[PDB]
Symmetry: D2
Subunit: 252 residues, 4 copies
């Protein structure tokens, strides 16, 4: 219970890595806002499983990448935190929600690009901007990046660009927020089983396993344990940092 | 005349670093498309000075960051290259055009963000995408980044994000384009006198000089000489690389 | 006997008599590891640490070895393998923390070949051979952590040899992580910024303080735990935002 | 006498008898620099390079020095400072290229303390002291370039000591660039990928070839020219897209 008394927002917490992060933070004693876009039943399962194991949670619906998305998010977040704790204080922020798309660089449209950049970099920036008014000293901001910012992959170039824009938040905000003692950091998972049918195809799973020096794709729990650490007092002297959680995928 | 027979596009070539790059490429014997948005007289001065010194140039008007911008750009580029050389071949691409904005991270609007990302990352990506159909083997793509991708500066965070998205192009496209022997690279200038009134204020110029290990802001020619090198056969074994041209500003 | 997440594991922390190494030792011991507290000549300090760990219910002992002299690794592992047998009946080493090291300022014009050999001998060479030797006694799931320095990222003319040595050290995490990947040994570098070991520099951290050794120990303890199982070959910045340009 | 952009400058290229160093020498000489072609024991190769440069209208001579043994730097600068006086009447050294180095594969379990000392002695130590000594005879606007390796970026277990040495070398560009900034000496690292020096590896470059020594020389010649005046402290990737993950 090292996060006892703390509050946390995890975006994209209805499934995958975000679900795992939400479960781990919850288990550590934080009140967790489990955020989602359209996965309402899934978000409620994640919220229940935190409570089931002795913690505290609720869900917040906000479709990111459209106008007024952050407003919707923080209206639901701050209301939920008020009614439950008596304040709007947000101690921990995990920008996890993300979209992925594969395709030849030749076939990328401007619509695809805007969507990618809107969800993966723009929303996170404005979520941080909005979080600054309600985040107490000693707060934590963690952005879930991708190892593809260090590994060339033409089929994922626009995704890559969007994550490279995301990583800049940690660098520039950690300087802004130093005297508030708010740490801002990027976690880069490698290929991670997010429970979607793609990781069931044995040939595809073989290929992705090869990329880690461990010979496996990651379980979401493995990323979640790194995020839990960054959220704790134990990671207080880490800020503006790129954390390689790819299982040795970035070895060249 | 080591670029004799080559063709080149420099975006944002009406002034500043782009003007300098255009002048240096021209001098080396390349036909240069001097690109601009609204600086028509300035672009024509740059085109004349290349001709004046014995080279070949024309200007192309394209306002970037709006729909159909790339179409406008490449309709003018390819027509100009056809009428002058008999082909639409583009040997060299310099994504230079850029917008800069300073302000507290708290005061950034979504409009400001879209503009920043649209001009500084999106346009460059689609310019590259469009350039691939007309670029011969042995071609060159050079993106002008910024040292602020390695130096925290809260007042320039959105600018930073946009350049971090830009740097990803070199990483992912250099893998895509390896077998065509097209090199893709990022140049990061530090603070550079772009001939704008800001570098006239002696207190501001003092501050910016301090940041280089040389104790000076850069002349645009100094960046241009690096770009000329990357454009040549001499830089043929450099691809997917981040070139620090900041005059020792990135030393920590 | 106080139980925690490292209950069952053995650990070697080089240079655990004072400073960062002491904090790492205290921290790993507190998490349940049996901790070999290594030292060159601070036996009194080392015993005080070993005693500190055993008082709070952990388990520890001290090992004497001067590093960067011929025979250094032999003497070190003689004492360690002995202590571990005594206490466990096995030579198994689950956790290796290469923390011991030397620091020296001075104009780069005045650096001598002797000064150079000293720096490399302690800061890079001994760490390599300590790792080489540990492989024979390290079980799968083990942990190797090399305490580097943020000075490999920040230019400091008066500390060029020291930087050189730490840059050589950082390469151990890169190349070994590939080597040990199938044996599940994670190999990482942790880079502290300015830290009050006890002996202007505060202006370097974004926080405007020098670190306390506990702030650094907390990162090392993390890397040593199962929670850090998917981090290997990494450079972990623990400088408190000193590498921000 | 064939004139170019380095007309007026003197240069030292360590290990210029064969391989990358030969290409650098030929290239700097062709650009007008008076080139000291250094070697350990390949005097025939070195003369052939020196002759090659003088035939094409440049200027050169050879210098004998075994590196990584006591006295190495003295012997080196004895020969250089002599050659330069003879030809110019001054000891001025405008350009220093630390290219000489040793390579060795082998299981990391079989690396010996002797093998380690050899690697560091040649690849990092001598380069440091060659730089230290050159400062006394290098005019403002000078150039220092250290030939590193992309192996500092790509994990290779069988080349851990070599990587270590090059990582130590890379630190020279970081710390000296700050030191020399006001004297306008640029200090850079250039990192080749797999290069055919003449003695599967092709699959590493995005181009699917091993480099020719000329491809690397072309980057070094650039760094040595005024065109590279605003690049210092940099790591220059010349691996032909080998560091792409
Ligand atoms: N999976 C990997 O291999 C991998 C590797 C490296 C990094 N990452 C990063 O890790 C993060 C999580 O990805 P994942 O694979 O674990 O999950 P995956 O199933 O996509 O799940 C994505 C989550 O983000 C939410 N989301 C998507 N678009 C949204 C939007 N426009 N507005 C609000 N929420 C939105 C989804 O909510 P709903 O359920 O409501 O649709 C869902 O909870 C992403 O940032 C991804 O880039 C993933
Ligand atoms: N200056 C520095 O200190 C510095 C440092 C590091 C990196 N950089 C980068 O270097 C590049 C050049 O900047 P600078 O300071 O030299 O020039 P600065 O005067 O802004 O000039 C910018 C150029 O980009 C063009 N441009 C701007 N917006 C455009 C748009 N929306 N569509 C088409 N063209 C547009 C401008 O054309 P018009 O004349 O038609 O308006 C102008 O030629 C930028 O990418 C900048 O980020 C600059
Ligand atoms: N201090 C900083 O600001 C800072 C910042 C970044 C990184 N670091 C690194 O953090 C590590 C610990 O730093 P520290 O400041 O805590 O150092 P410290 O206070 O000087 O203590 C160094 C430890 O190393 C041992 N040691 C020194 N030379 C040795 C040798 N030749 N053979 C065996 N042991 C030797 C000492 O043992 P004895 O008690 O017997 O002498 C002592 O336990 C070092 O590697 C240092 O490079 C320090
Ligand atoms: N080859 C690659 O694929 C590759 C890739 C990346 C980086 N590099 C680096 O590129 C540089 C040159 O590589 P290369 O492949 O061209 O090497 P090379 O073919 O083996 O030649 C090495 C040069 O170093 C000299 N040398 C060796 N040991 C010496 C010593 N102890 N003292 C003085 N000189 C010594 C040799 O002189 P003698 O003729 O008298 O023996 C020779 O001129 C090296 O630093 C290497 O690490 C090479
Ligand atoms: C889950 C997925 O559909 C599969 C995938 O292709 C991927 C995706 C997102 C990612 O961030 C990565 C990867 C990835 O492999 C992959 C492989 C190797 C290293 C990586 O960092 C990654 C990724 O970061 C989208
Ligand atoms: C020309 C300007 O109005 C002035 C400026 O603030 C700046 C601008 C753009 C930049 O890319 C940089 C810098 C910069 O200082 C500066 C200072 C120190 C290191 C840098 O890389 C930079 C920049 O890259 C906008
Ligand atoms: C304790 C000390 O005498 C002080 C010091 O100079 C230092 C020392 C060791 C270090 O590892 C660092 C630094 C350091 O400043 C310093 C300043 C700014 C960033 C750093 O990473 C460091 C260091 O890593 C030796
Ligand atoms: C000539 C050689 O015996 C071959 C070799 O193993 C190598 C050698 C020196 C090097 O610097 C490299 C490499 C290298 O592959 C290699 C493979 C992939 C990336 C690299 O940067 C490298 C190297 O830098 C020694």
């Amino acid at each position: 219970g090292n996060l006892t008394g703390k509050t946390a927002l995890v975006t994209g917490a209805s499934r995958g890595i975000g679900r795992a992060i939400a479960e781990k933070l919850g288990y550590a004693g934080a009140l967790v806002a489990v955020h989602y876009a359209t996965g309402a039943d899934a978000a409620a399962e994640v919220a229940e499983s935190i409570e089931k194991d002795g913690g505290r949670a609720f869900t917040v619906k906000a479709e990111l990448g459209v106008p007024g998305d952050v407003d919707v998010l923080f209206e639901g977040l701050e209301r939920g935190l008020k009614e439950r704790t008596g304040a709007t204080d947000l101690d921990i922020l995990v920008n996890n929600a993300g979209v992925m798309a594969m395709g030849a660089p030749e076939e990328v449209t401007p619509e695809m690009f805007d969507r990618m950049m809107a969800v993966n970099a723009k929303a996170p920036f404005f979520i941080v901007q909005r979080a600054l008014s309600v985040m107490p000293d000693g707060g934590r901001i963690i952005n879930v990046s991708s190892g593809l910012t260090r590994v060339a992959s033409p089929d994922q170039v626009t995704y890559g660009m969007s994550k490279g824009a995301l990583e800049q938040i940690a660098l520039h905000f950690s300087r802004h927020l130093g005297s508030r003692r708010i740490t801002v950091n990027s976690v880069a998972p490698g290929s991670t089983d997010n429970g979607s049918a793609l990781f069931q195809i044995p040939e595809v799973r073989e290929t992705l396993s090869q990329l880690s020096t461990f010979g496996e794709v990651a379980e979401p729990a493995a990323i979640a344990d790194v995020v839990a650490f960054l959220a704790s007092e134990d990671a207080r002297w880490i800020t503006g940092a790129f954390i390689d959680a790819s299982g040795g995928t970035l070895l060249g």
